[PDB]
Amino acid sequence: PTQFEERHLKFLQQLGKGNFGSVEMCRYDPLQDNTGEVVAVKKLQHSTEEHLRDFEREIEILKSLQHDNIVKYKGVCYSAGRRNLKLIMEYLPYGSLRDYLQKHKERIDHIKLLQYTSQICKGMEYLGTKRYIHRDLATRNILVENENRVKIGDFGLTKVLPQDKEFFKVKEPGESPIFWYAPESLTESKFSVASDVWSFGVVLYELFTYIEKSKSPPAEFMRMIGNDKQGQMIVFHLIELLKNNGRLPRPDGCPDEIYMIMTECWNNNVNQRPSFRDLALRVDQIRDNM
């Protein structure tokens, strides 16, 4: 069922909020008896014409994906007498991977981090078979179903590659998560599978820092750059730093072999970065040995 009538969609909780849209937890109860399905409902923060068109493309992308490690599309709800649009998704109860890492450290060890790493890689391989570039791969945009399962979410920045070319030039990006971007994304606005691989390197970094106090990518890059810098000066220094092999340090407790993977993902030469298939195989081989 992809129907969802607004009058049967009942509010339970406010979840995330920020850029573009906000997400609520709702119960869908057609039989009016207080016993139905729990879902996530995504709405626009500001419903302009431009944002509506983007939201429509996000919805088409999500509907096209069926994979264990990608959040499930359930449908749309045409609310306000069908003069508004909301996206209906499955509810994953443990929130973003970023929050989960902070809140549930008691149930997380290195084996679990490698499981999550592998699952993210598998999700990304699947994206590549559709020629979708995610552009925003980060622990805040990964969702946790349970202690054994994570799913890639937020496809708001996701783009399709053209017929022939391997890069997408994003004409004029708004607010940018610059500390997850590959050098070519910073200097040329060029986004590709290879730039998602760079970002994946940074996700792997986040996992092994356990999102600890002031070890996050923005905080570490700012330390190296100089905390007194502001404005475009930050970006100028980030670029120059990255072009001459400045990199995030190995987090404390992180094996050398896992840090080597990070550093291979952070190659300035786009063609020498591993594929997501290489990474999933290598990570599952590390796990299987032991």
Ligand X SMILES: CS(=O)(=O)Nc1cccc2[nH]ncc12
Per-residue interface string for the shown chain with ligand X, residues 75-114, x marking contact by CB under 6 A: --------------x-xx--xx------------------
CB-based contacts of 257: which residues, under 8 Å, 6+ apart? 286
Q: Cα Rg for the chain, rounded, in angstroms?
A: 20
The verdict on whether residue 16 carries a ligand-binding annotation is yes
CB-based contacts of 81: which residues, under 8 Å, 6+ apart? none
- Nearest Cα neighbor of 69 from 157, 153, 195 is 153
Residue 61 or 143: which CB sits closer to ligand X?
143
User: How far is residue 199 from each of residues 17, 46, 224, measured CA to CA in Å?
Assistant: 23, 28, 19
Cα 236 → chain centroid: 25
Q: How many Cα atoms sit within 13 Å of 140 on the Cβ side? A: 10
The verdict on whether residue 42 carries a ligand-binding annotation is yes
Residue with smallest beta-carbon separation from ligand X: 16
The verdict on whether residue 21 carries a ligand-binding annotation is yes
Specify whether 136 is catalytic.
Answer: yes
CB-based contacts of 176: which residues, under 8 Å, 6+ apart? none
The verdict on whether residue 17 carries a ligand-binding annotation is yes
With binding defined as CB under 6 A, does residue 69 bind ligand X? Answer: no
> What is d(CA 67, CA 164) in angstroms, rounded to the nearest whole number?
25
* Sheet with 37-44, side-by-side order of all strands: 9-14, 21-28, 37-44, 86-90, 73-77
Residue 141 or 267: which CB sits closer to ligand X?
141
Q: Using CB under 6 A, which residues numbered 12 to 51 contact ligand X?
A: 15-16, 23, 40
Residue 44 or 281: which CB sits closer to ligand X?
44
Give me the least distance between CB of 162 and ligand X, in Å please: 28
Q: Is the dihedral of CA 172, 176, 182, 183 positive or negative?
A: positive
Residue 76 or 194: which CB sits closer to ligand X?
76
Q: How many residues bind ligand X (CB under 6 A)?
A: 12
The verdict on whether residue 23 carries a ligand-binding annotation is yes
Q: Among residues 59, 62, 71, 138, which is the contact residue for ligand X, using CB under 6 A?
A: 71
Per-residue interface string for the shown chain with ligand X, residues 149-188, x marking contact by CB under 6 A: ----x-----------------------------------
> What is d(CA 145, CA 97) in angstroms, rounded to the nearest whole number?
10
Q: Determine which one of 68, 136, 228, 278 is catalytic.
A: 136
Dmax over CA atoms of the chain, in Å, equals 63
Residue 89 or 197: which CB sits closer to ligand X?
89
Give the interface with ligand X as residue ranges (CB under 6 A): 15-16, 23, 40, 71, 89, 91-92, 95-96, 143, 153
Which residues define the annotated binding site? 15-23, 42
Mark the binding-site residues for ATP, compressed into ranges: 15-23, 42
Where in the sequence numbering do the catalytic residues fall?
A: 136
